[PDB]
Design a protein around this ligand. Sequence first.
Ligand SMILES: [Mg+2]
Ligand SMILES: [Mg+2]
Ligand SMILES: [Mg+2]
Ligand SMILES: [Mg+2]
Ligand SMILES: [Mg+2]
Ligand SMILES: [Mg+2]
Ligand SMILES: [Mg+2]
Ligand SMILES: [Mg+2]
Ligand SMILES: [Mg+2]
Ligand SMILES: [Mg+2]
Ligand SMILES: [Mg+2]
Ligand SMILES: [Mg+2]
Ligand SMILES: [Mg+2]
Ligand SMILES: [Mg+2]
Ligand SMILES: [Mg+2]
Ligand SMILES: [Mg+2]
Ligand SMILES: [Mg+2]
Ligand SMILES: [Mg+2]
Ligand SMILES: [Mg+2]
Ligand SMILES: [Mg+2]
Ligand SMILES: [Mg+2]
Ligand SMILES: [Mg+2]
Ligand SMILES: [Mg+2]
Ligand SMILES: [Mg+2]
Ligand SMILES: [Mg+2]
Ligand SMILES: [Mg+2]
Ligand SMILES: [Mg+2]
Ligand SMILES: [Mg+2]
Ligand SMILES: [Mg+2]
Ligand SMILES: [Mg+2]
Ligand SMILES: [Mg+2]
Ligand SMILES: [Mg+2]
Ligand SMILES: [Mg+2]
Ligand SMILES: [Mg+2]
Ligand SMILES: [Mg+2]
Ligand SMILES: [Mg+2]
Lengths: 63, 144, 203, 58
Amino acid sequence: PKMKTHRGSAKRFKRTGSGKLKRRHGFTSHMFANKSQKQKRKLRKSAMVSAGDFKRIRQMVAK
Amino acid sequence: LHELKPSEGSRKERNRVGRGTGSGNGKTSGRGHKGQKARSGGGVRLGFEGGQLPLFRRIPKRGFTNINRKEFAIVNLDVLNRFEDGTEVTPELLVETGIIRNEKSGIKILSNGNIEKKLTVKANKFSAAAKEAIEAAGGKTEVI
Amino acid sequence: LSLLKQDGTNAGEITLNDTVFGIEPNEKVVVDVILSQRASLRQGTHKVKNRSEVRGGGRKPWRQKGTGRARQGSIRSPQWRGGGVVFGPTPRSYAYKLPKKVRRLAIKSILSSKVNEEKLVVLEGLTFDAPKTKEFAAFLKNISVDTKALIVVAGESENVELSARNLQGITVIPAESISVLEVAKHDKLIITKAAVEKVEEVL
Amino acid sequence: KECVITGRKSRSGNKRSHAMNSSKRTWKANLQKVRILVNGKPKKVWVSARALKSGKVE
RNA sequence: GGUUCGUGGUAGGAGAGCGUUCUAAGGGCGGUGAAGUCAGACCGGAAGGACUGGUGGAGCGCUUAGAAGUGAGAAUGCC
RNA sequence: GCGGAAAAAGCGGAGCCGUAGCGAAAGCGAGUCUGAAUAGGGCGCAUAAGUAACAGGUCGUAGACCCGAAACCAGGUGAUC
RNA sequence: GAAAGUUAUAAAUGAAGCGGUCUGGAAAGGCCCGCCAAAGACGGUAACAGCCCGGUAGUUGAAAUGGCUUUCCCUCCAGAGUGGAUCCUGAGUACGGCGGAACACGUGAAAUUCCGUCGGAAUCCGGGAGGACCAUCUCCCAAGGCUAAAUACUCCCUAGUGACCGAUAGUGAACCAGUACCGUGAGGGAAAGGUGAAAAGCACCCCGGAAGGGGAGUGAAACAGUUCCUGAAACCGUGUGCCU
Ligand SMILES: [Mg+2]
Ligand SMILES: [Mg+2]
Ligand SMILES: [Mg+2]
Ligand SMILES: [Mg+2]
Ligand SMILES: [Mg+2]
Ligand SMILES: [Mg+2]
Ligand SMILES: [Mg+2]
Ligand SMILES: [Mg+2]
Ligand SMILES: [Mg+2]
Ligand SMILES: [Mg+2]
Ligand SMILES: [Mg+2]
Ligand SMILES: [Mg+2]
Ligand SMILES: [Mg+2]
Ligand SMILES: [Mg+2]
Ligand SMILES: [Mg+2]
Ligand SMILES: [Mg+2]
Ligand SMILES: [Mg+2]
Ligand SMILES: [Mg+2]
Ligand SMILES: [Mg+2]
Ligand SMILES: [Mg+2]
Ligand SMILES: [Mg+2]
Ligand SMILES: [Mg+2]
Ligand SMILES: [Mg+2]
Ligand SMILES: [Mg+2]
Ligand SMILES: [Mg+2]
Ligand SMILES: [Mg+2]
Ligand SMILES: [Mg+2]
Ligand SMILES: [Mg+2]
Ligand SMILES: [Mg+2]
Ligand SMILES: [Mg+2]
Ligand SMILES: [Mg+2]
Ligand SMILES: [Mg+2]
Ligand SMILES: [Mg+2]
Ligand SMILES: [Mg+2]
Ligand SMILES: [Mg+2]
Ligand SMILES: [Mg+2]
């Protein structure tokens, strides 16, 4: 039977042109009084999935 | 049929484990010694990190899918040079020529490369640049 | 190449189309297609009973501990005399096709290879008034075939199949059915002019 | 034990906790023993309260 | 085709191979004795392969390719 | 799927992957998003190659390399002890 | 209900080598000659047969029973248009609340479908749906029923096929096997194929109570002797070249 896409990952990652996965930052809901404005600007942007993590999870989101 | 030689490199001999120590894949058959990964059907599920919260659960869900999303079929200019000067270019013409096979939502023209022939192109949408490049040559764009 | 009549006399010469019988043979493609066609002939009707399918088992033959015997879970465990087989054959298909263009290159190449080896004979026509194997054997001696030979006809020719049904090396096919494996299985390829047109119409 | 008119009877389903534990239960019809004429002859039969509503005669 | 530096090895990666059963094609052996089995002081770097003789009494190699129930000394394994 | 010999072809272009990406999305498009910005930066483009089939390696779903519990549940059989 | 046709259920006919030599127990094998083939399928026959046998291709065939297909008999049968005054068009129904379930959809914003319980329409100016809901538009007319085919499976039958097994395999079961045996019972559940081409299955003699043997004889072989193709290893012996 077809491999099943991991649906949690599909709601959180995006595939780029080159085939990398784009993601968002964690600490981006409440407890914002704690973080600095600089910290917030950075967290607000997107990130790429790390090499090691990609190796771990690439089959989960093939398709 | 008595001297078939398949293409060199096209076929290899499969590796059989657990057939003696000479092969180098005897006994433990490549699995090493003990633990979960040595067991039959053993192996943690795909993205499992042994109890560390998996990456996908450390990072938030984002966005939604638009029910009414419109993806267009793209036709960069360079491929319109395939047509003979004076010709008007409709969708159905781009089907017959086999430049687009499926026309999702419609045909959009984009400005990648450069056009040479005075066409009278009609597509569902146009890149500002594509419209400024068809006319630049000496052609009329109309939207359908 | 040369066109000869059923009797064996020279009838003229025919020009085979040089996109079908004239291309440089691709032996690698032919081998691939021959393997696929041999693999597709397979029936794959073979099964063994694993430990679930073998009659009985069910109960533990003796208690896990205390008896001084090896622990056992079923008299049908695979190390037991009449036990289930561990993997072994399961009914499956072996069939597979290469892409259409490869399968065409293959038939064109094997044909060109018959022409490169003077193994293709072209008859003006090939007809028998009634089914008569003696007449068919006489025909093959006139052509000087002697070996295994595939005969390719296409209508007009009638009573040929029956005439040659009881000869051991010789196989007769309409021009529509000309397959790589059938040509590979036969030293000489005897084809009527009428057939040649039919084969060129497809390739 | 079923309504003789409508066929209503016990059917099964789930009880559910606030926590969504499920355990099997039944829904019984609201059957009432009443004297009606089945085939002309009046006798005591189970009838659902729903069937007795308005129509039907005891 | 030669110079130079190498060639201990567990888990393990990589490579090239031996042998088993079956299929195809080709080419063979065999009642003047097949397979099997026994014996031997032969051959190959290994897996292994021959040859000769006994037993046996009817099937079996080889080549190229293909396919696998394909190789056991250990499981307090099963018979 | 049709036709056919459990053939071979032929027919079958529905669909699939690729040829464009960026954006949650509207959308714009060799750009795009962010942004007041003609700024910077992200991902892309400039620095084209895929696809079909087979074969090897590994992974996933299946018992998934083989053997082995104690237990659990369901339907029965037992008070000749 | 008939009739005709066809298929099934028994069958019939069916070409060509006693060919010559070699080996052999025996020839279907070797060598050398022929022949038939719409028949060179398979099997058997003293070793491997298209021409020896049963057959095979092809061609014929059915008193009887059943199946199928036509045709006849037999039975059964009203259809268009024009007008919407009036009438009818599925009620404890549809829907709703509450509790559940099914829907890929876990009560969710939850349409749609069903169950129990209670409440409960409109009913042609009428009604339902389009994923809460309202309006518009579009499509539809529930609460009555029937309906072949394409699909699923195989205890069976007929004909076949297999880069499926070949007696620890393949069915548990090639063999009088769900037997023997075990169990109060439900239930569990084996082992076990091969003389030879043909019984020609060892007359007769000898030792022995017999078993068993040695001769004689049969056979190609009996070291093929009624559990009798081959007959490995463990294991058990006898003899003796070297050592102790
Ligand atoms: Mg927030
Ligand atoms: Mg290897
Ligand atoms: Mg390896
Ligand atoms: Mg190693
Ligand atoms: Mg070992
Ligand atoms: Mg270990
Ligand atoms: Mg350890
Ligand atoms: Mg490990
Ligand atoms: Mg924790
Ligand atoms: Mg959210
Ligand atoms: Mg079982
Ligand atoms: Mg002990
Ligand atoms: Mg078995
Ligand atoms: Mg060294
Ligand atoms: Mg080394
Ligand atoms: Mg053998
Ligand atoms: Mg094995
Ligand atoms: Mg052992
Ligand atoms: Mg419990
Ligand atoms: Mg009782
Ligand atoms: Mg008592
Ligand atoms: Mg005869
Ligand atoms: Mg003789
Ligand atoms: Mg013999
Ligand atoms: Mg025989
Ligand atoms: Mg509704
Ligand atoms: Mg509800
Ligand atoms: Mg549900
Ligand atoms: Mg609604
Ligand atoms: Mg209700
Ligand atoms: Mg809506
Ligand atoms: Mg929806
Ligand atoms: Mg209605
Ligand atoms: Mg058995
Ligand atoms: Mg045996
Ligand atoms: Mg014996």
